[PDB]
Amino acid sequence: DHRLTDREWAEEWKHLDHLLNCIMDMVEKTRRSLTVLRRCQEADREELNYWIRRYSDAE
Amino acid sequence: DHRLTDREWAEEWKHLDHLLNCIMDMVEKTRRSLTVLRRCQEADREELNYWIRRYSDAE
Amino acid sequence: DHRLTDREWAEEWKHLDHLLNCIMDMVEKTRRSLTVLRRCQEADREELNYWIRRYSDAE
Amino acid sequence: DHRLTDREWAEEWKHLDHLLNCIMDMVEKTRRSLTVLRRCQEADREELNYWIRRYSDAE
Protein backbone atom coordinates (compact mmCIF):
# COMPACT_ATOMS: atom_id res chain seq x y z
CA ASP A 1 0.00 0.00 0.00
CA HIS A 2 1.80 3.23 -1.13
CA ARG A 3 0.02 5.35 1.45
CA LEU A 4 1.72 5.93 4.85
CA THR A 5 -0.08 6.27 8.16
CA ASP A 6 0.69 9.37 10.05
CA ARG A 7 3.13 7.52 12.22
CA GLU A 8 4.94 5.95 9.18
CA TRP A 9 5.01 9.37 7.56
CA ALA A 10 6.56 11.10 10.58
CA GLU A 11 9.05 8.26 10.92
CA GLU A 12 10.03 8.58 7.28
CA TRP A 13 10.74 12.32 7.69
CA LYS A 14 12.76 11.57 10.75
CA HIS A 15 14.84 8.99 8.96
CA LEU A 16 15.48 11.37 6.10
CA ASP A 17 16.55 14.01 8.63
CA HIS A 18 18.89 11.45 10.18
CA LEU A 19 20.36 10.38 6.85
CA LEU A 20 21.17 13.98 5.92
CA ASN A 21 22.74 14.60 9.30
CA CYS A 22 24.92 11.47 8.89
CA ILE A 23 26.03 12.69 5.42
CA MET A 24 27.11 15.96 6.94
CA ASP A 25 28.88 14.10 9.76
CA MET A 26 30.78 11.97 7.29
CA VAL A 27 31.73 14.96 5.19
CA GLU A 28 33.33 16.49 8.31
CA LYS A 29 35.07 13.20 9.20
CA THR A 30 36.43 13.35 5.64
CA ARG A 31 37.64 16.96 6.26
CA ARG A 32 39.34 15.72 9.37
CA SER A 33 41.02 12.93 7.48
CA LEU A 34 42.35 15.37 4.92
CA THR A 35 43.67 17.66 7.70
CA VAL A 36 45.65 14.71 8.97
CA LEU A 37 46.87 13.86 5.50
CA ARG A 38 47.90 17.43 4.83
CA ARG A 39 49.81 17.73 8.07
CA CYS A 40 51.62 14.54 7.12
CA GLN A 41 52.26 15.99 3.65
CA GLU A 42 53.74 19.16 5.08
CA ALA A 43 55.91 17.44 7.54
CA ASP A 44 57.19 14.95 4.94
CA ARG A 45 58.00 17.88 2.62
CA GLU A 46 59.95 19.67 5.43
CA GLU A 47 61.90 16.42 6.08
CA LEU A 48 62.49 15.98 2.31
CA ASN A 49 63.82 19.51 1.82
CA TYR A 50 66.03 19.05 4.91
CA TRP A 51 67.56 15.87 3.48
CA ILE A 52 68.09 17.33 0.04
CA ARG A 53 69.94 20.19 1.71
CA ARG A 54 71.99 17.66 3.79
CA TYR A 55 73.01 15.74 0.71
CA SER A 56 73.93 18.84 -1.24
CA ASP A 57 75.95 20.24 1.74
CA ALA A 58 77.85 16.86 1.58
CA GLU A 59 78.26 17.29 -2.24
CA ASP B 1 54.25 13.65 15.44
CA HIS B 2 52.60 14.83 12.15
CA ARG B 3 54.36 12.18 10.09
CA LEU B 4 52.56 8.84 9.47
CA THR B 5 54.27 5.47 9.19
CA ASP B 6 53.54 3.60 6.07
CA ARG B 7 50.96 1.52 7.84
CA GLU B 8 49.21 4.62 9.35
CA TRP B 9 49.31 6.24 5.92
CA ALA B 10 47.71 3.27 4.14
CA GLU B 11 45.12 3.01 6.90
CA GLU B 12 44.28 6.69 6.55
CA TRP B 13 43.68 6.28 2.78
CA LYS B 14 41.53 3.30 3.47
CA HIS B 15 39.42 5.17 5.97
CA LEU B 16 38.96 8.04 3.57
CA ASP B 17 37.90 5.54 0.89
CA HIS B 18 35.43 4.07 3.38
CA LEU B 19 34.03 7.45 4.40
CA LEU B 20 33.38 8.41 0.76
CA ASN B 21 31.72 5.07 0.10
CA CYS B 22 29.45 5.57 3.15
CA ILE B 23 28.49 9.07 1.89
CA MET B 24 27.47 7.57 -1.41
CA ASP B 25 25.55 4.82 0.39
CA MET B 26 23.67 7.36 2.45
CA VAL B 27 22.89 9.49 -0.57
CA GLU B 28 21.24 6.41 -2.15
CA LYS B 29 19.35 5.59 1.08
CA THR B 30 18.12 9.20 0.88
CA ARG B 31 17.01 8.61 -2.77
CA ARG B 32 15.17 5.56 -1.57
CA SER B 33 13.46 7.52 1.15
CA LEU B 34 12.30 10.11 -1.34
CA THR B 35 10.96 7.37 -3.67
CA VAL B 36 8.85 6.18 -0.79
CA LEU B 37 7.71 9.69 0.02
CA ARG B 38 6.83 10.38 -3.58
CA ARG B 39 4.82 7.21 -3.95
CA CYS B 40 2.93 8.23 -0.82
CA GLN B 41 2.47 11.71 -2.29
CA GLU B 42 1.04 10.32 -5.51
CA ALA B 43 -1.26 7.95 -3.86
CA ASP B 44 -2.53 10.59 -1.42
CA ARG B 45 -3.17 12.92 -4.38
CA GLU B 46 -5.15 10.18 -6.23
CA GLU B 47 -7.23 9.61 -3.05
CA LEU B 48 -7.71 13.39 -2.63
CA ASN B 49 -8.90 13.91 -6.21
CA TYR B 50 -11.23 10.91 -5.81
CA TRP B 51 -12.82 12.39 -2.69
CA ILE B 52 -13.19 15.85 -4.17
CA ARG B 53 -14.99 14.23 -7.09
CA ARG B 54 -17.19 12.23 -4.63
CA TYR B 55 -18.17 15.34 -2.75
CA SER B 56 -18.92 17.32 -5.88
CA ASP B 57 -20.99 14.41 -7.34
CA ALA B 58 -22.99 14.64 -4.03
CA GLU B 59 -23.26 18.47 -4.48
CA ASP C 1 60.50 18.20 -10.80
CA HIS C 2 57.18 16.43 -11.30
CA ARG C 3 56.63 16.96 -7.55
CA LEU C 4 54.63 19.99 -6.47
CA THR C 5 55.84 23.27 -4.97
CA ASP C 6 54.59 24.36 -1.58
CA ARG C 7 52.04 26.56 -3.27
CA GLU C 8 50.87 23.80 -5.62
CA TRP C 9 50.27 21.50 -2.60
CA ALA C 10 48.38 24.30 -0.83
CA GLU C 11 46.16 24.71 -3.89
CA GLU C 12 45.44 21.04 -4.05
CA TRP C 13 44.21 20.79 -0.47
CA LYS C 14 42.20 24.04 -0.86
CA HIS C 15 40.54 22.56 -3.95
CA LEU C 16 39.57 19.47 -1.85
CA ASP C 17 38.26 21.66 0.85
CA HIS C 18 36.12 23.54 -1.68
CA LEU C 19 34.63 20.34 -3.03
CA LEU C 20 33.64 19.31 0.50
CA ASN C 21 32.17 22.69 1.01
CA CYS C 22 30.11 22.35 -2.17
CA ILE C 23 28.77 18.99 -0.86
CA MET C 24 27.72 20.50 2.46
CA ASP C 25 25.98 23.39 0.69
CA MET C 26 24.18 20.94 -1.64
CA VAL C 27 23.04 18.93 1.42
CA GLU C 28 21.82 21.88 3.44
CA LYS C 29 20.03 22.95 0.25
CA THR C 30 18.33 19.54 0.11
CA ARG C 31 17.38 19.95 3.78
CA ARG C 32 15.71 23.20 3.07
CA SER C 33 13.89 22.00 -0.13
CA LEU C 34 12.54 19.12 2.03
CA THR C 35 11.12 21.43 4.68
CA VAL C 36 8.90 22.98 2.04
CA LEU C 37 7.93 19.69 0.40
CA ARG C 38 6.88 18.20 3.77
CA ARG C 39 4.67 21.21 4.16
CA CYS C 40 3.13 20.72 0.69
CA GLN C 41 2.66 17.01 1.35
CA GLU C 42 0.97 17.70 4.61
CA ALA C 43 -1.41 20.15 3.03
CA ASP C 44 -2.54 17.42 0.65
CA ARG C 45 -2.85 14.82 3.38
CA GLU C 46 -4.97 16.97 5.56
CA GLU C 47 -7.06 18.23 2.68
CA LEU C 48 -7.92 14.52 1.94
CA ASN C 49 -9.06 14.01 5.57
CA TYR C 50 -11.12 17.16 5.14
CA TRP C 51 -13.13 16.00 2.10
CA ILE C 52 -13.63 12.61 3.66
CA ARG C 53 -15.18 14.26 6.74
CA ARG C 54 -17.32 16.73 4.86
CA TYR C 55 -18.53 13.75 2.78
CA SER C 56 -19.40 11.82 5.93
CA ASP C 57 -21.29 14.78 7.52
CA ALA C 58 -23.37 15.06 4.32
CA GLU C 59 -23.73 11.21 4.42
CA ASP D 1 -5.20 26.42 -4.80
CA HIS D 2 -1.93 26.82 -2.92
CA ARG D 3 -1.49 23.05 -3.43
CA LEU D 4 0.57 21.89 -6.39
CA THR D 5 -0.58 20.42 -9.71
CA ASP D 6 0.59 16.99 -10.75
CA ARG D 7 3.27 18.59 -12.86
CA GLU D 8 4.43 20.91 -10.07
CA TRP D 9 4.85 17.87 -7.74
CA ALA D 10 6.77 16.03 -10.48
CA GLU D 11 9.10 19.02 -10.81
CA GLU D 12 9.71 19.17 -7.13
CA TRP D 13 10.81 15.55 -6.82
CA LYS D 14 12.94 15.86 -10.00
CA HIS D 15 14.65 18.89 -8.48
CA LEU D 16 15.44 16.77 -5.36
CA ASP D 17 16.74 14.03 -7.49
CA HIS D 18 19.02 16.47 -9.30
CA LEU D 19 20.45 17.78 -6.06
CA LEU D 20 21.28 14.22 -4.99
CA ASN D 21 22.85 13.66 -8.32
CA CYS D 22 25.00 16.77 -7.91
CA ILE D 23 26.18 15.42 -4.50
CA MET D 24 27.17 12.06 -5.98
CA ASP D 25 29.06 13.76 -8.80
CA MET D 26 30.86 16.04 -6.31
CA VAL D 27 31.82 12.95 -4.25
CA GLU D 28 33.07 10.88 -7.15
CA LYS D 29 35.00 14.00 -8.17
CA THR D 30 36.59 14.10 -4.71
CA ARG D 31 37.43 10.40 -5.08
CA ARG D 32 39.23 11.04 -8.27
CA SER D 33 41.12 14.18 -7.02
CA LEU D 34 42.30 11.98 -4.09
CA THR D 35 43.71 9.28 -6.34
CA VAL D 36 46.07 11.85 -7.82
CA LEU D 37 46.98 13.46 -4.50
CA ARG D 38 47.86 10.06 -2.98
CA ARG D 39 50.16 9.59 -5.91
CA CYS D 40 51.80 13.01 -5.37
CA GLN D 41 52.12 12.34 -1.65
CA GLU D 42 53.72 9.02 -2.27
CA ALA D 43 56.24 10.51 -4.65
CA ASP D 44 57.35 12.87 -1.89
CA ARG D 45 57.48 10.13 0.73
CA GLU D 46 59.59 7.88 -1.34
CA GLU D 47 61.83 10.68 -2.53
CA LEU D 48 62.59 11.40 1.20
CA ASN D 49 63.58 7.73 1.76
CA TYR D 50 65.76 8.09 -1.32
CA TRP D 51 67.84 11.06 -0.10
CA ILE D 52 68.16 9.50 3.31
CA ARG D 53 69.66 6.37 1.71
CA ARG D 54 71.95 8.16 -0.69
CA TYR D 55 73.13 10.20 2.33
CA SER D 56 73.82 7.04 4.29
CA ASP D 57 75.76 5.37 1.40
CA ALA D 58 77.95 8.50 1.18
CA GLU D 59 78.18 8.40 5.04
Q: Which candidate, C54, A36, A56, C37, places its Cα nearest to that of B56?
A: C54
Q: Is A16 exposed, middle or buried (0-12, 13-18, 19+ CB in 10 A)?
A: buried
Q: Does B35 touch chain A (CB under 8 A)?
A: no
Phi, psi (deg, nearest 5) at residue D15: -60, -40
Q: Does B30 touch chain D (CB under 8 A)?
A: yes
Sign of the Cα torsion C23, C24, C28, C29 reads: negative
Question: Method used for this model?
Answer: X-ray
CA-CA distance, D41 to D47, in Å (whole number)?
Answer: 10
Resolution (A): 2.0
How many separate domains does chain C show? Answer: 1
- Comparing CB atoms, the residue among A37, A40, A55 nearest residue D55 is A55
- Residue A4: closest C-alpha in chain C: C45
Alpha-carbon dihedral angle through residues D47, D48, D49, D51, given to the nearest 10 degrees: 90
Amino acid at site B9: W
DSSP per residue, B3-33: PPPHHHHHHHHHHHHHHHHHHHHHHHHHHHH
CA atoms within 13 A on the CB side of B36: 16
Task: Report residue B42 CA to chain centroid gap.
Answer: 18
Task: Determine the structural domain holding residue C16 and report its residue range.
Answer: 1-59
Measured between alpha carbons, how far is residue D50 from residues A17, A41, A46, A47, D56 in Å? 51, 16, 15, 12, 10
CB atoms within 10 A of CB A41: 24
Contacts of B40 in chain C (CB under 8 A): 41
- Comparing CB atoms, the residue among B9, B30, B41 nearest residue D9 is B41
CATH number for the domain harbouring residue C4: 6.10.250.230
Alpha-carbon dihedral angle through residues A25, A28, A29, A31, given to the nearest 10 degrees: 170
CA-CA distance, C21 to D58, in Å (whole number)?
Answer: 48
Task: Report residue D31 CA to chain centroid gap.
Answer: 3
